[PDB]
């Protein structure tokens, strides 16, 4: 029963692991395949948190369009790459370690509002209390999450859908207009 407890933490570790194989892989398209694996780990986490809708939107849109675009580029184009030699990146290692420490801690800092800096960080780790889920019988219809997105994209934020249409238009016009060579 408690084998099903650490899943979220496992995915975190697994996601960490995947990024080290992205930035360090001899072949490029092997590392882009590791990125596809990282999208799959993300969709695992999104089902695992309770958002089963998004996981399939990630597998549809990111894996099935953006990664297919990337692999399709790497095939018929020329990209040189150098291996992860120790001699070229051992000079980077100290600024890597300093930036790991600072950017990690300072990303963990703004979730919290004590004026004292050390009290900001420890509130990042005090999560071990279990939220209580109560059944309320106030809702009468199966408004899923995608229904509510389609109500708020279409009434309250219809202009954002319409400016978004201008952006999708631009994403059509642009690549065309570069790669035409008209006449």
């Amino acid at each position: 029963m408690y084998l099903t407890y650490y899943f979220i933490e496992i995915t975190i570790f697994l996601a960490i692991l995947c990024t080290i194989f992205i930035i360090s892989a001899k072949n490029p398209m092997v590392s882009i395949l590791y990125m596809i694996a990282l999208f799959v780990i993300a969709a695992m986490y999104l089902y695992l948190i309770g958002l089963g809708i998004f996981s399939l939107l990630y597998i549809m849109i990111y894996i099935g369009a953006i990664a297919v675009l990337f692999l399709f580029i790497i095939t018929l184009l020329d990209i040189n790459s150098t291996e992860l030699s120790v001699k070229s990146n051992i000079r980077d290692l100290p600024l890597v370690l300093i930036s790991l420490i600072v950017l990690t801690i300072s990303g963990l800092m703004i979730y919290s509002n004590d004026s004292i800096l050390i009290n900001k960080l420890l509130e990042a780790f005090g999560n071990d209390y279990n939220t209580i889920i109560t059944q309320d019988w106030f809702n009468i219809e199966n408004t899923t999450l995608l229904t509510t997105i389609g109500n708020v994209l279409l009434t309250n934020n219809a202009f954002i859908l319409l400016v978004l249409a201008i952006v999708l238009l631009l994403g059509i016009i642009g690549p065309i207009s570069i790669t035409m060579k008209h006449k």
Binding site: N113, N156, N157, I160, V163, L169, L170, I173, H182
Partner: protein, 469 residues
Amino acid sequence: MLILAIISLITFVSMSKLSDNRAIIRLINIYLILVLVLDSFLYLLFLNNQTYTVMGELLIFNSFTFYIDMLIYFIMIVISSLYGYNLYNNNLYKTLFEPKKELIILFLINILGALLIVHSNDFITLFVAIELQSYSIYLITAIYNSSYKASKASMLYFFMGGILSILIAYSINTYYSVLNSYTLHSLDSLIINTLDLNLILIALSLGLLFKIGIAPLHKWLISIYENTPILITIYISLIPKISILSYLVLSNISINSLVISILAILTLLVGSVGGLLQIKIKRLLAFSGLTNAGYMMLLLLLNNNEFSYLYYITQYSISHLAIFMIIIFSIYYINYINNQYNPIIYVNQLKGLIHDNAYLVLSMAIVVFSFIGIPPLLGFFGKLNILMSILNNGYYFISIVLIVASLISALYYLYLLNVSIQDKNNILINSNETVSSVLSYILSSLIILITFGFIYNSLIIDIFNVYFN
């Protein structure tokens, strides 16, 4: 009415030939003119600083933003006249200054993305409109693709705009993680006391500001401004500056900011002493943009800065636009044209300019003494009204560093004059073909605004007293 222009235009450009492209831009030029003339009267809505929120807590319309809107239309009428009109009727200038088919498409989509920031209340409206204008600057840079430098600059601008878009997005979602809210309208001056929103709002400001050219991260923008051709770069210099700055001046999230104050000091320093020993005119001319974007970052620290801002905006826009238009005209008089996209580069190429079209040097002088802040010209009241806001509000070390930065920045402004009023051995005696009447009238109009624009200072302030108070 930009929407109707884009929807009509790209259908119309799909059916026109290549040779029609020029004349298409002429049409759009006149179109935007009759959006200024026949639609200005909407300023009557904005009496006594009445503000509207349209599309449901989404776009905020005040008269500050109405003025920014009108300024962006005026400068586009200029830039569109630069593409749509011939300089001369030579076989030379047809292959040097020639618009692409889809150029005006990306222009109007860019102005759309730049207006949906200054008018913006929401953060996702902010994010979508920054993304729209960032794509448009990507594609306006890469549209002259048969150039090595422009393609390298478009790639550089892509990655450095991607980082500072994900920093803005991280700041928006960091703000959301502590407040279930999207507006800075929710802040309402009680919350800032009891909530540590310093690091959030400051990081949001920074991720918006590093796209301007603020000075720790200024080298990549000077490289893009030198690598792009001479017509693309008077647009991509001006538009993200006035759009992003008139966002951040409207919403006052960095007041008593120590980080914005450091970066303002550092900007005024390494902008004035950056562009001193430089020999390329777009370089020289792009560190003038770094210092004059430094004078804005001061006004972000301010409360109630809407006079100093707007006046120094239209100052910098007219002066900017005029000094780029002057070195378009000096191309006929140089003895050496390289690099078809960027025909004048080195600042010693305009050397004998007083002996050939001396009133181009009168024009050049009048605009460059206005960058320095000489009092009969319009640039001085801009620097003056910035100084009146800086000293009012306790920024005393900022003020003397402003002054030292203005004095250092006068050197490489006067280097343009030093080179221009010199002896040249071979002077022009007569020219067969002359310059476009409707296009040189624009430079004459842009000077007479700078020269004789201190006249209306009184009138403007009284008008400023009614519609913003």
